[PDB]
Structures are given as structure tokens and as C-alpha cells.
A paper describes a structure:
DNA needs to be compacted to fit into nuclei and during cell division, when dense chromatids are formed for their mechanical segregation, a process that depends on the protein complex condensin. It forms and enlarges loops in DNA through loop extrusion. The core SMC complex is a heterotrimeric ring consisting of two SMC proteins and a kleisin, and in condensin these are Smc2, Smc4, and Brn1, respectively. To complete condensin, two HEAT repeat-containing proteins Associated With Kleisins (HAWKs), Ycs4 and Ycg1, stably bind to central regions of Brn1.
Second, from the same dataset, we solved the structure of Ycg1 bound to DNA at 3.2-Å resolution. In this structure, the region of Brn1 that binds Ycg1 and makes up the “safety belt” (residues 387 to 524) was mostly resolved, with the exception of a disordered connecting loop (residues 411 to 458). The DNA covers most of Ycg1’s positively charged surface, and we could identify more Ycg1–DNA interactions than a previous study using X-ray crystallography, which used a shorter DNA. The fact that we observed Ycg1 bound to Brn1 while not being bound to the head module of condensin strongly suggests that in condensin’s clamped state Ycg1 remains attached to the rest of the complex via the flexible linkers provided by Brn1 either side of its interaction site with Ycg1. Our cryo-EM data provide clear evidence that condensin can bind to DNA via Ycg1 and the clamped head module simultaneously.
Numbering used by the authors:
A (entry chain C): 387 to 410, 459 to 524
B (entry chain E): 8 to 188, 205 to 402, 413 to 503, 568 to 788, 791 to 911
The structure:
DNA sequence: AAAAAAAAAAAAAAAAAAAAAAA
DNA sequence: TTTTTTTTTTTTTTTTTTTTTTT
């Protein structure tokens, strides 16, 4: 029973949020050219070089939610008597 | 002709410098000599033009290139060596030179105005190289004009919202140079809103530490990236050092310590331990009392997980720590917590030398505890004395009581301590613990506790009868008695028949207090009744309708305690307390659980109900389908999106249940299709509601993927060998295809059909099931008007099924 | 002797190919 | 003519720690 609990605690360690996070050579400086500066220095034209406006702000601020630690130890014990441990995964 | 020679010289210098880093000083020297000769003869414009021409040839290079990485460093070293001359000339005395400040200013101006001609180029490599050159030159630039500064600020504020993350990192490296005690407001906007993690890391590392920007820097301790959560402990706080105890607020500091010593990753925990045990300890003078004083020790519970870490990195300090007889009768909170931690760490291991050469005897510890008890409750602040007594009691609870004199002394001490009425709840709890540790068997601690409770009750009764001159105790007496009895019942593990004293205390104290008007007395009585029902089965059977009525009709705490009691009763006993002659039926309890699940006004009650129901389903108790369906629906519900604890509990309880036993997976598969049916209806009403949070509910394709993940026979933990033959996921797909004729919208149909080619198809599977699936897929492909992606997915599924069936047909 | 550049491994997650609508 | 989303698939870069290298 201990091996199964350890396996479930190790495998399900990164998926505690749920929701959508359930998934487990040499440049020659002597050669001169003309089209080089034209291809380097030019206008953007059609190809956009900026990110969309919707992908600029986020309300979640890319922060982790409050952790409550749901492991096998918490679910094995009782409620009003944490000393006893019911028989599960067996 | 001189221009050709200048170009040849500079090109030879660049060709010799792009090789290796060895010799990047003679190149700077010859470049300075060439520039001096050019400005002396009168041809600096040609020199600048050719320098720009030869520098432009490194822009199209990719980031992962060393040839381009050498030229930028060469240019940076050139600028630095050209400015350091003027710096030294202005530093030592006042030496008049041959007009070099204007030449330097013009050179930097033209070089900046030339490199900025590709800041909006379509090639990302050119923009990266331009921004890298700007970042590496911004260190040595001196004073510039207002127009160039405005152009630079405009370009940076335009390129900070770039598409490529590397260009954004270079932009923040450029912007971290124009800060002062507009750039700060831009940097603090990227540390909280940028989608890339490297950009946030760069903005956090390259930001000034001030009273207005410190919260934004420390907020990254809960980032979604492990490197960002580790760098706040292994770089920022390390660089701050002793200023963490002066500038960081106490509560923010405690929250940071909690987040560091309780992370789900090993790297963050190791970094926090390295910061606490080594850097913060070495920043002082190697002492530990000052480190304990910097932390709050009292009014907190994190040092227990901190000092222990300090005992796992540096054991040598564990040897230079003593408690002589002189340091007594004058403890503080730090010394008491230190003694407790030392004793616990020495007992948890096998460090016996310190055990017999450091800690005193029991007869002396009893007197030392009685001294503080007398100072507190019979004669230094009160909180300090209570903390000292609590620490000493915690240390004595796990004490070696081989001798009889010390055991009797500690027993007398704990009796005289628990015989008081002013004692607090934690002190009562730790006294009950020490009393249990000071008993021979279970027939002695219970008798002593019952005797203490009866003595308190009789003393109150006698005082009332005596004051009556000049048969029911007061409410406070009942409260203290129930509080003392709860901790006693929490340590009894024997049938109730063998204990007649508890049977008398039942109808003498607990049972009259169950039906009391006061809410706290009622709650304590319900708790005691539950702790007693988890000992006898007849009392548990006879006491269930009252708990049901308490859950149905009662306050928040009453329903809380009653639900906990019911869950514990079902976990200890089982289906014995229900279904029988004179017993409460299961339908009423199921209805109560339904009502407490649908009630959104009590989130904690929802969390407790979900946890208890998952605990019951994980065992052999509660084998129903509608209850499991309601649980899965409550997990996938838009209403329950605000409750984080419920979601976090379901996300851990559902997979372990589905992967423990194949019967559980079959039970899940028998209802997942109907769950998806009821779920595809709530999404339509949410998308067509004009009143809201349309992004709260998950999209149906993610729900279908998660349901297919739970019905996969390859995720089982047993793997006997016949798992490749069992067909659990096929029945779910058949039921989904049958329900497919009930969906109204077309986008839902599309996102359901697209996520079909993901099941497990093998040869050891059944034949009739695969056949039936084939006719179902054929009917859906023919008698329907699909799009193109769904049609292609269905055709691929039908081709796979036909191949498997043709392969199975060639046999026997 | 002190500082800088190059190389191997661990850690940890962002990146990319195919196909059908959309502006 | 880009671009945009969804599904399915396979690397790529970073950071810490060691060796050489250049005075």
C-alpha cells in the first residue's frame, strides 16, 4: 500500500492545479556588395513585427494559485481523529 | 586613394579580430592609431563610413554565432578604451588635449544613428544584433543630445512589445540603463504582463531595489516558472543580505519563508535551505540566537521547518551548543524553542552522545516546568511564559521516563497544571499529550482525566451550593469540561464496553449538552458524540438522524462538524450503520450530500463533502453511479470555479480512484458519456447568455480529452497482463457516438469528432465491439453533413478500424 | 595568481510540422 | 498574399560547474 501511495504522490506532483494543466563560418570583409544593405535595411511591408494587443496584458499576472497540498497522507487520515488511518488503495 | 588604404587596414583588423579573443588590445591600439591619422590628415567621414560598412556585415547573423559575438565585444572595447582616456584626462589635473571630446561625441552619434536604421527590419536577426549592440554600448556612452535620447526612448518603447522574446530581452537590457531613483514604469509592466518567462526573469534581475519596486520584485516568488521561483531565493535575497530583516515587512518575510520551505519542487527548497542555513548564518557572526531573533519564532510556525534544515547542512554547530545550570529560571522564547528543536532532532536520530551529555533529568525538568507554571498561574509577560511552558511540555512529551521518581514528579506536575481553570487550549492539549505519555496503560489516563473532569464539576457544584446560602453547572464549566474531554477521547482506541466511565460521562455530560441552546456547547457536544461513535457501533447506529437534522438545519460550524462526524463514522464502520431494522436509510443521506454539494453559499462545506465522498468511494463503501456523476459534474461546473480547494481536491482524488482498480475505471466509463452530454448543454447556455465569465468553464474538447485520459487502460498501476484485452475505452466512444445525434450546434460536433483519433487500438481487443464501432463510424460518415477536418478524422478512424479487422480476420 | 573564454551535463520547458478556413 | 487555429510530434536552449588560456 505504501508503494502505491508513493507512486501516486510522485507522479501526480506537477498536476495539482487541474483545470487545463492536467497534461503530464568565416565572413570576408573585403568583398563589397550592393543588395546587402538593401536586404538588411528595408521596410517591414506586410510581415508584422509586433505582438497582438490581446496578448499584451493578463489579469492572472502569471502567478501560481494558493496551494492546499492534497497528498495521500491528507486523504488517508480521518477528520476529527488524525491519529487513525483508514485502509485505502488496498 | 587614402580611403582604399583606410578600408584595407580596418578590414584586415576586423579579419584578424574575428578569429579568437586573444589579442583584442593591439587591435584596439591600431584602430585608435588609424583614427588619429585619419582625423589628423582630414578624413574622418570616410573612416566612419567604412566602419559602419564593415559593422553592418554582422547583423544578418543568427544569435547562435561566435563570429558575430566577437565583433560586438570588439566595438564595445573600442568605445570603452576611447572613453576611458577622456575620463582619466578629466580625472587627473586638467590636461588640454588635441580636440578629442568632439570627435568622440560625433563618432558615437553617427554610430547610433547608423545602427538604428535597422530597428524595424523584417529580419529578426538584424533587430537582435542592433539591440545587442545598443545594449553593449549603453554602458559607455557619456552625454548625448536630446534628439538622440528621445529617438532611443521612442525606439525602445516601440520594441518592448516585440514578437520575438529575444528581442524583448535585449530591449529590457537596453532599458535597464535609463533608470533613476518612464523606464521603471515600463519595466514593472513587463514583470507582470509579459507572456515569456525569460523576459520576466530579465526584468526582475535588472531592476533597482527601492521601496516602490521591491513588492513587484518579491511577487515573482510564486511564478509559474521554476527558474523564476528559484532566482528570487538564490540571487535577489542573497544580494540583499542583512537588509532583508530591515526593509522587508514581517508578514511578507514570513510568507516568503512559507513559500520557500513548502514548494512542490526540490530545487526551490534546496535554494531556500542554502539561503537560510549558510548565507543568513554567515552574514552574522556564526551565532544562532540572533538568527532566531530575526525570525518571529513566537506567533508563527515556520522555524520548526527552518532550524531543522540548519541541522542538516552544518552539524558542527550542533556540537557547540549547551544548557548549563546557570542559564535557568530566565529563559526567553528563543532558548525554549532551541531546546525543543535540539531534543526533537536528537531523538529523531541516534545522536546519543548529546542525549546523555546535554539534556538534564526528568526530576529537574519537572521542577523547571513547575517554576514557570507557578510564575504564570499562581503569581515576564504572559505570552512569553505560556510559550515557554508550551515548549517545555512539547520537549517533555517525548522524554525518556525510565526512572520512577521523575515519572511521578512529572505526573504530579501535569495534574497540578491541568487542575486549573485559567489554562489555555494549547496548554490543555499538550498536557493531555504528556499525561498520555506518563501512563502505564489505557486504563489509567482515562481514569485520571475523568477524575479531573468530575473534580472540576463537583467544585463548581459545591461553590454554587455554598453561595446559595448567603444542581446545574454554568456554561463556562461545561465548555471547559467538553474541551478537556475532546482531547481525552481523541486518544482512546478501545471498545466502549470496556470503559464504563466514558459510558457515564456520555449521559452525564455529552448527551445533555447535545440538545443545548447555545451554539458552542452544541458544537462541542456533537464533536464529543462523534468521537464516541467512532468507538462503539450501537451508539453510532442510534445517533444518525440527529446528525442528519444538524446538517440539514444548522449554522455553518454545526454542519461542518456534523459532516465531519458522518464521514468519519462511515470511514471507521461502514455500511453497517445503514440499511437495517431501526436504521437510517441511505437515500436520505444521499439527498443530504446532494443538497450540501449544490449549496454554493458554503464553500468549506462543499470541500469537506467532496473530500469525504472521495474518501468513501476510494474504499468499498458507497458504490453508486449517480453520486459519482454528480461529483464529476461539480468538478466540471462553471459555478464551482471560484472554489480552488474543491478543484484541487477533485484533481487529485479522481485520477487515483480511476487508476487504482479496473472496476473504478469501468464505473467512470459507464457515466462519462452522460457527463459529457450534460456538460455540452451548459456551454451553449453560457456562450449564449447576455447578462458574465464565459472563460470560466472549460471548452468541450478539453473535457473530452480529460475524460479519454481517465478511461485509458494504459494508465493503470497494476498492469497484470490482460489489460491489453479489456475494452473499456471502446464502450465510452460508442456511447459518445450514439449521443452525437443529440448535439445541436456544429462547432461542438466538430470539436468532439476531431478528438476521436486518440484511443488505444490493439489486436488483443475484442471483435464484435470493433465491428459495432465500425458500423457506427460508417453511419456517422454517411448519414451526416460534416466539414473537412472532421471528415478526415473519421476517415482515418475508419481506415484504422478496417485495417485492424482485416488483420484479426486472418487468423485461425 | 587573478580574470576571461570554452566545453560537458543536468534541468526544465518552449518549439515545430500539416491542414483548412480567414483577412 | 499572410495569418490563424487545432492536433500531433520532436528537439532546442540555459544554467551551473569545471578546465584551459592570457596576462
Amino acid at each position: 500500500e505504501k508503494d502505491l501511495m508513493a507512486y501516486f504522490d510522485e507522479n501526480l506532483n506537477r498536476n495539482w492545479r487541474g483545470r487545463e494543466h492536467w497534461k503530464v563560418l568565416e565572413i570576408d570583409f573585403f568583398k563589397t556588395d550592393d543588395s546587402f544593405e538593401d536586404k538588411v535595411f528595408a521596410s517591414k511591408g506586410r510581415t508584422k513585427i509586433d505582438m497582438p494587443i490581446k496578448n499584451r496584458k493578463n489579469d492572472t499576472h502569471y502567478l501560481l494559485p494558493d496551494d492546499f497540498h492534497f497528498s495521500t497522507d491528507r486523504i488517508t487520515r480521518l477528520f476529527i481523529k488524525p491519529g487513525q488511518k483508514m485502509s485505502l488503495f488496498s | 586613394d587614402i580611403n582604399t588604404k583606410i578600408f584595407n587596414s580596418v578590414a584586415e583588423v576586423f579579419q584578424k579580430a574575428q578569429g579568437s579573443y586573444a589579442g583584442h588590445r593591439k587591435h584596439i591600439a591600431v584602430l585608435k592609431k588609424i583614427q588619429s591619422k585619419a582625423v589628423e590628415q582630414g578624413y574622418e567621414d570616410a573612416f566612419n563610413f567604412w566602419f559602419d560598412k564593415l559593422v553592418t556585415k554582422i547583423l544578418p547573423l543568427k544569435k547562435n554565432e561566435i563570429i558575430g559575438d566577437r565583433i560586438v565585444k570588439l566595438v564595445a572595447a573600442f568605445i570603452a578604451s576611447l572613453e576611458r582616456e577622456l575620463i582619466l584626462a578629466k580625472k587627473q589635473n586638467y590636461k588640454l588635449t588635441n580636440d578629442e571630446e568632439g570627435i568622440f561625441s560625433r563618432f558615437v552619434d553617427q554610430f547610433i544613428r547608423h545602427v538604428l536604421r535597422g530597428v524595424e527590419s523584417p529580419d529578426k536577426n538584424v533587430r537582435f544584433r542592433v539591440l545587442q549592440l545598443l545594449a553593449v554600448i549603453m554602458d559607455n556612452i557619456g552625454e548625448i543630445d536630446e534628439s538622440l535620447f528621445n529617438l532611443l526612448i521612442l525606439s525602445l518603447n516601440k520594441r518592448i512589445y516585440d514578437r520575438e522574446p529575444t528581442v524583448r530581452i535585449q530591449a529590457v537590457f537596453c532599458l535597464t540603463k535609463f533608470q533613476d531613483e518612464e523606464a521603471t514604469r515600463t519595466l514593472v509592466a513587463s514583470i507582470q504582463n509579459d507572456p515569456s518567462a525569460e523576459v520576466r526573469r530579465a526584468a526582475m534581475l535588472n531592476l533597482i531595489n527601492d521601496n516602490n519596486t521591491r513588492p513587484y520584485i518579491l511577487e515573482r516568488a510564486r511564478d509559474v516558472n521554476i527558474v523564476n521561483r528559484r532566482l528570487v531565493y538564490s540571487r535577489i535575497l542573497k544580494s540583499m543580505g542583512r537588509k532583508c530583516f530591515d526593509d522587508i515587512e514581517p508578514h511578507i518575510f514570513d510568507q516568503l519563508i512559507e513559500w520557500g520551505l513548502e514548494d512542490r519542487e526540490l530545487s526551490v527548497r534546496n535554494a531556500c535551505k542554502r539561503l537560510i542555513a549558510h548565507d543568513w548564518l554567515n552574514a552574522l557572526d556564526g551565532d544562532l540566537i540572533e538568527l532566531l531573533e530575526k525570525l518571529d519564532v513566537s506567533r508563527s510556525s515556520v522555524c520548526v521547518k527552518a532550524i531543522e534544515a540548519l541541522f542538516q547542512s552544518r552539524p558542527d554547530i550542533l556540537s557547540k551548543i549547551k544548557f548549563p545550570e546557570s542559564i535557568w529560571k530566565d529563559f526567553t522564547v528563543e532558548i525554549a524553542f532551541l531546546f525543543r528543536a535540539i531534543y526533537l532532532y536528537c531523538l529523531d536520530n541516534n545522536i546519543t552522545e548529546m542525549l546523555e551529555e546535554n539534556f538534564p533529568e526528568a526530576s529537574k525538568l519537572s521542577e523547571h516546568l513547575n517554576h514557570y507554571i507557578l510564575l504564570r498561574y499562581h503569581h515576564f509577560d504572559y505570552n512569553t511564559l505560556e510559550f515557554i511552558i508550551e515548549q517545555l511540555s512539547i520537549a517533555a512529551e517525548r522524554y525518556d521516563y525510565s526512572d520512577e521518581v521523575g515519572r511521578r514528579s512529572m505526573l504530579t506536575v501535569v495534574r497540578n497544571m491541568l487542575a486549573l481553570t485559567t489554562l489555555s487550549e494549547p496548554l490543555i492539549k499538550i498536557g493531555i499529550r504528556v499525561m498520555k505519555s506518563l501512563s502505564i496503560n489505557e486504563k489509567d489516563f482515562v481514569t485520571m482525566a475523568i477524575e479531573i473532569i468530575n473534580d472540576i464539576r463537583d467544585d463548581d457544584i459545591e461553590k454554587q451550593e455554598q453561595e446559595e446560602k448567603i444542581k446545574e453547572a454554568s456554561s463556562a464549566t461545561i465548555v471547559l469540561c467538553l474541551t478537556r474531554s475532546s482531547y481525552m477521547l481523541e486518544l482512546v482506541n478501545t471498545p466502549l464496553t470496556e470503559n464504563i466511565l466514558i459510558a457515564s460521562l456520555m449521559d452525564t455530560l455529552i448527551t445533555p449538552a447535545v440538545r443545548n441552546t447555545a451554539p458552542n456547547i452544541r458544537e462541542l457536544g456533537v464533536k464529543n458524540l462523534g468521537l464516541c461513535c467512532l468507538l462503539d457501533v450501537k451508539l453510532a447506529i442510534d445517533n444518525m438522524y440527529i446528525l442528519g437534522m444538524c446538517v440539514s438545519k444548522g449554522n455553518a460550524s454545526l454542519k461542518y462538524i456534523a459532516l465531519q462526524v458522518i464521514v468519519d463514522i462511515f470511514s471507521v464502520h461502514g455500511n453497517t450503520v445503514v440499511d437495517g431494522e431501526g436504521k437510517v436509510d441511505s437515500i436520505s443521506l444521499h439527498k443530504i450530500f446532494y443538497k450540501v454539494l449544490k449549496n454554493n453559499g458554503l464553500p468549506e462545506c462543499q470541500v469537506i463533502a467532496a473530500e469525504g465522498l472521495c474518501k468513501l468511494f476510494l474504499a468499498d463503501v458507497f458504490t453508486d453511479d449517480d453520486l459519482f456523476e454528480t461529483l464529476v459534474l461539480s468538478y466540471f461546473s462553471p459555478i464551482n470555479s471560484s472554489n480552488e480547494a474543491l478543484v484541487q481536491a477533485f484533481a487529485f482524488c479522481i485520477p487515483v480512484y480511476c487508476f487504482s482498480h479496473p472496476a473504478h475505471q469501468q464505473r467512470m466509463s459507464r457515466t462519462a458519456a452522460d457527463i459529457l452530454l450534460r456538460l455540452c448543454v451548459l456551454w451553449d447556455d453560457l456562450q449564449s447568455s447576455v447578462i458574465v465569465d464565459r472563460e470560466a468553464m472549460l471548452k468541450p474538447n478539453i473535457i473530452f480529452q480529460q475524460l479519454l485520459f481517465w478511461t485509458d487502460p494504459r494508465n493503470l498501476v497494476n498492469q497484470t497482463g490482460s489489460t491489453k484485452k479489456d475494452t473499456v475505452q471502446l464502450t465510452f466512444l460508442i456511447d459518445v457516438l450514439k449521443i452525437y445525434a443529440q448535439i445541436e450546434k456544429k462547432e461542438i460536433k466538430k470539436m468532439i469528432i476531431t478528438n476521436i483519433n486518440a484511443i488505444f487500438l490493439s489486436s488483443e481487443q475484442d471483435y464484435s465491439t470493433l465491428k459495432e464501432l465500425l458500423e457506427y463510424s460508417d453511419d456517422i460518415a454517411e448519414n451526416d453533413n460534416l466539414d473537412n477536418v472532421s471528415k478526415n478524422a473519421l476517415d482515418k478512424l475508419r481506415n484504422n478500424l478496417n485495417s485492424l479487422i482485416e488483420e484479426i480476420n486472418e487468423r485461425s
